[PDB]
Amino acid sequence: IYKLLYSEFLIFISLYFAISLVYRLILSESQRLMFEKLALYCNSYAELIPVSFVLGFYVSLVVSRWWAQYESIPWPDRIMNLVSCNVDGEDEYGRLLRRTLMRYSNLCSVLILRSVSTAVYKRFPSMEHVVRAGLMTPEEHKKFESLNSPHNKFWIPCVWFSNLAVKARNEGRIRDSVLLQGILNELNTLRSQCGRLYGYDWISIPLVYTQVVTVAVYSFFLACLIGRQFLDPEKAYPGHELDLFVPVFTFLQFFFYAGFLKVAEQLINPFGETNWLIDRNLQVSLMAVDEMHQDLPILEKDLYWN
Amino acid sequence: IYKLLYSEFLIFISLYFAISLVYRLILSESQRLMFEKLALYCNSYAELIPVSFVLGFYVSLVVSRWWAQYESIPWPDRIMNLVSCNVDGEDEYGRLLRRTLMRYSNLCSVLILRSVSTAVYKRFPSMEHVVRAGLMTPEEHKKFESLNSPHNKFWIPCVWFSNLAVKARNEGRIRDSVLLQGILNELNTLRSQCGRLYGYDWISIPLVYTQVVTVAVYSFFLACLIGRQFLDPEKAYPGHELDLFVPVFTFLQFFFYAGFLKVAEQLINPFGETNWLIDRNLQVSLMAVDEMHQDLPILEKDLYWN
Amino acid sequence: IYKLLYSEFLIFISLYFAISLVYRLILSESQRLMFEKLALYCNSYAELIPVSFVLGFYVSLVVSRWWAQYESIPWPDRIMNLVSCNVDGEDEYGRLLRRTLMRYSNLCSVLILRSVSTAVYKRFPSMEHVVRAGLMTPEEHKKFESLNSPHNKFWIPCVWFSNLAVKARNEGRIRDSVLLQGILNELNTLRSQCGRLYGYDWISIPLVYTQVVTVAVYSFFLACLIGRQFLDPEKAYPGHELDLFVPVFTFLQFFFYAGFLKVAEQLINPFGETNWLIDRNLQVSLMAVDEMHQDLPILEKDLYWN
Amino acid sequence: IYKLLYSEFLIFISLYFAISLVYRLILSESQRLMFEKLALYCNSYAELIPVSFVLGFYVSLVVSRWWAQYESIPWPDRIMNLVSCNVDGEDEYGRLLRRTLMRYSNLCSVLILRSVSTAVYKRFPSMEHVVRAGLMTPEEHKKFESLNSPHNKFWIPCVWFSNLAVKARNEGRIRDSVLLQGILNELNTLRSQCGRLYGYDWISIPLVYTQVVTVAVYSFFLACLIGRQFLDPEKAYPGHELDLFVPVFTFLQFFFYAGFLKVAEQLINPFGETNWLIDRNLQVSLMAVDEMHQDLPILEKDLYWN
Amino acid sequence: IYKLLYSEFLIFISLYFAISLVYRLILSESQRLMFEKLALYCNSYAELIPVSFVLGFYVSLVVSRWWAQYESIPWPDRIMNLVSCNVDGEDEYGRLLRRTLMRYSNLCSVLILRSVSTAVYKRFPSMEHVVRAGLMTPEEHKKFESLNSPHNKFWIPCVWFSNLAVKARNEGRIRDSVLLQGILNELNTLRSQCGRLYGYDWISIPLVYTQVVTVAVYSFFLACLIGRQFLDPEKAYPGHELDLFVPVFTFLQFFFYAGFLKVAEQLINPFGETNWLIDRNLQVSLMAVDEMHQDLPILEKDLYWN
């Protein structure tokens, strides 16, 4: 939080100490008494601004939407267990057939993470970077851009997947219709999880609810630039009986009320190590359909037999 | 929120400054002292109205019902992956057969969004506008209005869908019974999601719970038209030691307590870009069952082979 | 809320103005000073009763159980899509066979709504009213009451349903075993939703948690019959510096703290237009298995073909 | 709550009135002034103990775990609809075969409710009481106790169930493999619901979180034995201007803060009428597989035919 | 909580009594008056630190993530019911075949619990301890470490499982394709539950949200080392009218605000008796596929027959 509060905090340190130096050195004595009345006014009536109430529900919606995206991580490990076993063949066709199926299922999640996450988007700026990272063969790029559509194209590989499995069934690679439908029902589970992330980016927390909660924090501490001044102890106002030149508890109070504001900036749109997550789901999925197709260990007895 | 608070806010600015001009220019000195006693009374006892408690749970129910409708967006991308692959045929019959199936599944969500959303309803005022936008052929409109029913008719295409797939199976287009049941089980998932939006419009947040929370905000600031007046500083009441002619912190306090009231007016009934969402789900679904039926890219090797 | 607060509110108006007339006209001057000490005592120490804390969680459980019953509305539209297509036959047997299946599935929800809802129970007082409304033939009523069971009998039609579909399969009306199991798996989804409403009536919010929250509201305002009196302004107590003869902010405070109590009486047991919901689910379900069995519109081309 | 607060409440009535009689009759006048200083100290500084904050989240976890167990009630009505229809046979074997299947599915929930509920455990103290109540034949008791296992044995009938259905399939009682798998997939739903109750008893709310919230209530009112004393009105302390000999609002404040503590004792471990629930699920399940196997009513026409 | 608060509590007892002894014995009388002004300053302005607000939501996220992991306990009892019945064979091959399937399904949860739980990790430090506990034969360890992968390897047995069942089907041990797919669909449910625990360890509660809530507790009671001092009663400050040498209510206030901090340290990463849970899921799963394959009790009549 110290990195996120290097900008807004030191402005508030600067905006306080400016006004503190102006009051102590620049104002005439007749004009200081004008400042003392506004300082007593803004100290008692800045509690009318519901800072703990407005900011309290905005964290209850940034985070309750933040947690709903980590049940939305598309793991290919459910399709991987069924492509590895059912799509038969050890020759260079069926070995190529299984690697293509688990490459489309990962491409159906890279094309959505490069529109919701800046970390993936700086790894894959254009579509040419997807080809050079092995997620798309050059012959698939020509078919990807003859399909003229002004919308997002993350649904392209999840239709190529389901058309390849049926083509795989009609050549005898998948045995029955039930084993074919078992793959397609696990495609549409990963299509739902990828379909959530597209739905969460397109449906943000509304602008009407963000512009409210950023005034309630800033207009509070705008009044605290005046209402938290150390007044003159010679006038002996009730409450300001001591001069200390640094408001310790005001700067702590700005640290937390603006702290949740900078936290909720972060958690409204996460994924700002998906560079690691994509490198896992590609390296595992191609591993478990090529090296582990029928390579099983040897069946032997356990330590509990008779 | 500034657009939503152009009406209620400037009335409250007008209702304050009217009474402020009446007290400062119209009341006699004997009658001003009558006003000063009511101003001190309504300042101390307007805190008895639980504004932060009544409004606190109404936002907890407008929004917790608002978020439950965005898991209810009917996406056709689960039926689209199975109509594209299983319903065989490249001739002009099966090409027409697949386009009809994905047109009924989109029509089973336009007919529910034109009764829950004013944006869709101004795009489709009558049923004639649905025909001219290609969602319904003219021969389907005659069958749509011989079915005499006083209720909503959004369930009509989702029965025409399931009767067409079985007619498609009996002509040999779908291979097995499992692949037929795989389509119908994914119909009834989109029928459940469309069934939620019909259930959410018919079950609103009750009138007994809205009429409570709109008195608690308005009757508070009705007392704040009197209890927040800048009194005469010559009388030297405790608290009103300064005249400033504009209550800054009261107008901020009205900005947030009526702010959540106008936000909860918006989020109790959302969809007031479904004009874009309908144009996506029609343009994608007809694309992936006509241009992408067996048009697959050429299988080649990846960048990780040996 | 005005209809629900016609009884408890006017008692509280009467109980206040009685004591206000007794203090102003009946008590002797020596006995008025005894009343002034109890009024100051009950004004400062009635804040010890946690009204906003006890009532705050009871609304958090009435409503969080209220919202869980509207995902429990049994819609027959999932069984209707599969009875309409799979149960073949156009003769007067299979036409009678499909209407019987969708009549048992609606009877398996009327028999549970006539034990959880007073609105349905006044429409169907006895079992004879169910026969005259067409939900049960007279020959089914004799079989319904030879089954001797002291418990609820809402599970009777959902077993008659699953025994009729298997009898329908053995006569050749349903084609395969998968299409039979597709109907029975959608029966057991509607059996779960009807099974929730039976579980919610049998498991109420406990008596130990309702008797707490109805003392905390009533014993608060029992003290507010004394602690909110307008005292004599001649004695000049701190706080009671003005006589106004009507406590406006106390009557508003009773309007909301007893307001949530009457709201939570309503939402602990909803359905007190299920007379419309039953008339929809019967009129739609019999419509879509008799008039819409194989009556499909004519396949023609859309407005986007070449 | 009056039954649950007969023990802790009257101790607090006794502990108050003891100290009240000691202060008024036993202490010397010099020693009373020592007591008056501690009474003023414990009145102002007992508000530092966060009673409304510590107890506020413990109710938010007792009840949020309490409500998650009533979606965990194992209803046999999903298996009952499939055993009644698919397991064929009207002779004394298949009649015995269906009754055994629905008896194992109820025994797979009695053996878990006799370890989580004291009400079931006093009905079934040992395993011999299960035999005499008809839930287990004497020949099944010998096989139940040759299976040597130090853990809980509630999973024993749910494996005997799935081994009997496959034995039923190999004798021709169940027709296809899909109808066999339809029973086993509905077994594993009731195995999950019974698996929740075993998981909820084994994972309690931790001891580190219960010992916190029982100090915060008791150490508060331990200070309220001193801080709520009616002091001497002759000394004229601020606040204690009246002697009344019974603290009405303190005893109400103890009624609710200890009220939620006794409520959360009840709802952390419910089921302390499962004697009725077990008698329902046995009497219904054996009824709907013996009297209602193919006993259907006669098909006749409804009141809406032509 | 007493064990968890042996470290931080006695430091706070020591840090208080140090400053209390310094003020009472070391400071000069002119320097004591400097301390009295800071004690009055830190007593009134330490309430500006939102301790009950910052810590209130951190418990709402530690625990709401804590409860979501106990629906994530991988129970093998759903696969166990289907391996026991469908994988046929009583000879020493099929007896070895069923024990291997339920050993891979337990190994697919030990390899994830030895990276998320320190209790399992001290039981299984290296992979050699897994072999000596019977969870992995020595021939499986060579195949486990030829699969070169820098990521976690918990997905290895859940692919060996699905490759063994298909190898079991092609030798005639499993009858149909539906019974094969019934096992694989229950594998991918246990793969999802094991997939949650890997997702919960990799996605912790962020460092930006923990470093906030540990300053708000500690910087509060850092000021309470000064603001809670018993001042000199001879100076007669308002509030400090009594010397007692031990702040009872401050030490209680530190007991709960730091109490939730130490509780949330525990519940952010639970499983710190999984040594019992692993010993159950191995001893039960191998028991119900070897001793209970077709060993059923003898079918006899119940106590309710005619």
Coordinates of N, CA, C and O in Angstrom, one line a residue, chain A residues 16 19 35 38-40 42-43 221-229 231:
Chain A
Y16 N -1.3 20.1 3.4 CA -1.4 20.5 4.8 C -0.3 21.5 5.2 O -0.7 22.6 5.7
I19 N -0.7 25.2 4.0 CA -1.6 26.0 4.8 C -1.2 26.3 6.2 O -1.4 27.3 6.8
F35 N -9.6 32.9 10.4 CA -9.2 31.5 10.1 C -9.6 30.6 11.2 O -9.9 29.4 11.0
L38 N -13.3 29.4 11.0 CA -13.5 28.4 10.0 C -12.9 27.0 10.4 O -13.4 26.0 10.0
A39 N -11.8 27.1 11.2 CA -11.2 25.9 11.6 C -12.1 25.2 12.7 O -12.2 23.9 12.7
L40 N -12.8 25.9 13.5 CA -13.7 25.4 14.5 C -15.0 24.9 13.8 O -15.6 24.0 14.3
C42 N -15.2 23.7 10.5 CA -15.0 22.5 9.7 C -14.5 21.4 10.6 O -14.4 20.3 10.1
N43 N -14.2 21.6 11.9 CA -13.8 20.5 12.7 C -15.1 19.7 13.2 O -15.1 18.5 13.4
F221 N -11.4 15.0 3.5 CA -10.0 15.4 3.9 C -9.7 16.8 3.2 O -8.7 17.4 3.6
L222 N -10.5 17.3 2.3 CA -10.4 18.7 1.9 C -10.8 19.6 3.0 O -10.2 20.6 3.2
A223 N -11.9 19.2 3.8 CA -12.2 19.9 5.0 C -11.2 19.7 6.1 O -11.0 20.6 7.0
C224 N -10.5 18.5 6.1 CA -9.5 18.3 7.1 C -8.2 19.0 6.9 O -7.3 19.0 7.7
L225 N -8.1 19.7 5.7 CA -7.0 20.6 5.5 C -7.1 21.9 6.4 O -6.1 22.5 6.7
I226 N -8.4 22.2 6.7 CA -8.6 23.3 7.6 C -9.0 22.9 9.0 O -8.5 23.4 10.0
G227 N -9.9 21.9 9.1 CA -10.4 21.4 10.4 C -9.4 20.7 11.3 O -9.7 20.5 12.5
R228 N -8.2 20.4 10.8 CA -7.2 19.7 11.6 C -6.0 20.5 11.9 O -5.0 20.0 12.3
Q229 N -6.1 21.8 11.7 CA -5.0 22.7 11.9 C -4.7 22.8 13.4 O -5.7 22.9 14.2
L231 N -4.2 25.1 16.1 CA -4.5 26.5 16.3 C -3.5 27.1 17.2 O -2.6 26.5 17.7

